[PDB]
Design a protein around this ligand. Structure first.
Ligand SMILES: Nc1nc2c(ncn2[C@@H]2O[C@H](COP(=O)(O)OP(N)(=O)O)[C@@H](O)[C@H]2O)c(=O)[nH]1
Lengths: 431, 431
């Protein structure tokens, strides 16, 4: 359909980057609706060589308008760095990007809090959380934060900013024993950027209503994996916001009924970064094989990604939560060379009961044992294949089995980083 | 449609109590998806006049299951009361209600933290004081708060609580200079009933999915009013949670594409309780007539009930937000006898431009001039009519001016307080 949602169906790192660049070639509007400066996108597919964490890759294409919805927490410092960075590369960012007046602002004290929490809690163990994304979401729901619209009335901004800073400084020094952030400095850093940010503000709700009825192709883009959904993922091993397709309405202002197609990116195997339940995790050279052939090193500074077989039970939960229309399968070639391949079809519970549904957070994620289905592997390479006929029989059976177990089709298959090394079986836009 | 979502399209008080009760006759499931114990639905029961603020109205219906989704902040204290009230009136609540384990819990400290927050920045003014819904969400967001699901391990629960209580006690004592909530008083109160709640729990998204395949009739019930939306409302004049249809998915776990029909209840004229922009407020004798005639003297919930003509411009926005399917014109009987009726169609901004869209929820509302469309009225009584023929000819014109102005049809018409005083022109369930 005309309005499409693209998101990861697992726990992150599924390989959505390329698909997004590919599908952004046909879109008029590209919209961010959740998370913050944690998108992660290394430009290669037409993009020089840089990682954008806030602005969408649609910012490269001259025919598209990139929109940052209200569901996105906005750090004025992160943005300006990315802009000037692109502007240095001659990309006219300020005339191709639009923002919502309701986007919460991430500010020095928000980062300051995160850095202390990562200290206060536990201990120094690769504290990769000092971003300020969660704290901006807290101030919002608690109704004491600031938004972009607030930058319209500079007088009242100072007033508001002082009241909220006083409160954060209190806990910073009297509870955390950290340093106090300086109010005047933050007011100054913000004031100097205000005229710029407001020149981009637009009524995002009304604009999309226009695109929809006019019939334009709008691509909605998710940034974190589905199972990290604050509400339905593995609590507390979840993010600070909703990551499923259900977040498109609140994070952008459009009605839930105006979601046509929902494309879910599925990697051929499993990976998790950090703590949290993971039944299919492999603690052998297979897990190793998958880690090395998949470049699953996405965790620099003494860290790593957990590896494993595809878990159709967990994926089933994603289908449910995201009302997925189709799947896009990635990293299938990582499997080339495996004598046998496995697929988790059911979880066995402690009392011997087998179930096809994910455990109620408060349950046996700890006691569940994986019911595997083992199937033949392949020796021939799949990398770069551009037609289903280039695929061996075993890989074709794997793919269809996923479909049977899951009940949803695989409408796109990516066999390599090149645009043409893609198999579009249905096309999200024109179907 | 099997999946019907019901909700007020303005600022609350749109008169939805009767509609929800009516649709409840054909619903198999009635779901609460957002807000907390401030979703008041008054109703007669056994000669006694009780009001429910948490439990869905379908609790009376014999074969209806009432479900409190994860998007709702739960207050056990406020749950036992209602329950105790109805189980006394002879109704088997424990057997007709179910609830999500992912529901954040609202405890004494939350209210403590709420109270202080108002009487503080607002001795003889405004703030947040009250229920403790927002402090309850802020915790969900920071990833500290507890969930029904925690109740399964009575010991893990104890330690979790001690920690959060320490963090919050510090705040109240040092930052606030308020009394420090007793950890054991809370512990004892939550354990006194842990096992009642853990026994009404169910996997709600898996359930609603089962229902969606067997084609059962599910109704979703909103609590507040669209324009009070935390994100898309008249900021800063808004409430705690989201109020649009966007939250049915996030708040219950149901996929976006499964929302079939969104009924937006809409009052025949406007009212607002408390401070906030209100471009159609009347300051003449008509305003007093609507107030009086509609018995709006803070009757349902109002410490100050302002009134005005219908704001088609603001109503247009409510359509975008919820992707409404149909309206339910309410209280038209309150307009009988008016020599003339008005509907607002555009706003004149203080800069002299005229606009048909909700100016940014941060511009110059108090300075906006509404362009009024004047229309002839009716001397006849519309109060009590049961068929759309015994209705005047001016009343139908009004009804049509609204339809064309919003692009959405009216499918039900409440012509009075008694259930039978209803004209279901289309019925959401068969639609
Ligand atoms: N006169 C009149 N009163 C109505 C109409 N529809 C609802 N009411 C009344 O106006 C008030 C509206 O609030 P309501 O939602 O019913 O209350 P609740 N939330 O169920 O307690 C109630 O008295 C209701 O009975 C109508 O068309 N005409």
């Amino acid at each position: 359909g005309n309005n499409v949602v693209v998101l990861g169906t697992q726990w992150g790192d599924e390989g959505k980057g390329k698909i997004v660049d590919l599908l952004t070639e046909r879109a008029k509007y590209v919209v961010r609706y959740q998370g913050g400066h944690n998108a992660g996108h290394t430009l290669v597919i037409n993009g020089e060589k840089t990682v954008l964490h806030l602005i969408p890759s649609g910012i490269l294409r001259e025919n598209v308008t990139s929109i940052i919805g209200n569901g996105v927490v906005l750090s004025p410092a992160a943005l300006m760095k990315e802009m000037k960075e692109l502007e240095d590369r001659g990309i006219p960012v300020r005339e191709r990007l639009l923002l919502s007046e309701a986007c919460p602002l991430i500010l020095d004290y928000h980062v300051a809090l995160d850095n202390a929490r990562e200290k206060a809690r536990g201990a120094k163990a690769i504290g990769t959380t000092g971003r300020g994304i969660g704290p901006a979401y807290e101030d919002k729901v608690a109704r004491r934060g600031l938004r972009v619209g607030d930058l319209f009335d500079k007088e009242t901004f100072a007033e508001k900013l002082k009241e909220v800073m006083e409160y954060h400084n209190f806990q910073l020094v009297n509870y955390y024993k950290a340093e106090a952030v300086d109010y005047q400095k933050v007011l100054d850093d913000t004031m100097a950027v205000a005229d710029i940010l407001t020149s981009m503000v637009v009524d995002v709700s009304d604009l999309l209503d226009q695109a929809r009825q006019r019939g334009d192709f709008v691509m909605f883009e998710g940034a974190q994996g589905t199972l990290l959904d604050i509400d339905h993922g593995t609590y507390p091993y979840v993010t600070s916001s909703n990551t499923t397709a259900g977040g498109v309405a609140t994070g952008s202002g459009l009605g839930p009924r105006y979601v046509d197609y929902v494309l879910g990116i599925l990697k051929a195997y499993s990976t998790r970064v950090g703590a949290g339940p993971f039944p299919t995790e492999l603690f052998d050279e297979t897990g190793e094989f998958l880690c090395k052939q998949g470049n699953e090193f996405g965790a620099t500074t003494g860290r790593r990604r957990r590896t494993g077989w595809l878990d159709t039970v967990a994926v089933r939960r994603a289908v449910q939560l995201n009302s997925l229309s189709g799947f896009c399968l990635t990293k299938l070639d990582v499997l080339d060379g495996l004598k046998e391949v496995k697929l988790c079809v059911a979880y066995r519970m402690p009392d011997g009961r087998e179930v096809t549904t994910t455990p109620l957070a408060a349950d046996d994620w700890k006691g569940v044992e994986p019911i595997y289905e083992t199937m033949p592997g392949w020796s021939e390479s799949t990398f770069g294949v551009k037609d289903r006929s280039g695929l061996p029989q075993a890989a074709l059976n794997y793919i269809k089995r996923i479909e049977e177990l899951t009940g949803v089709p695989i409408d796109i298959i990516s066999t390599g980083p090149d645009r043409t090394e893609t198999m579009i079986l249905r096309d999200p836009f024109d179907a």
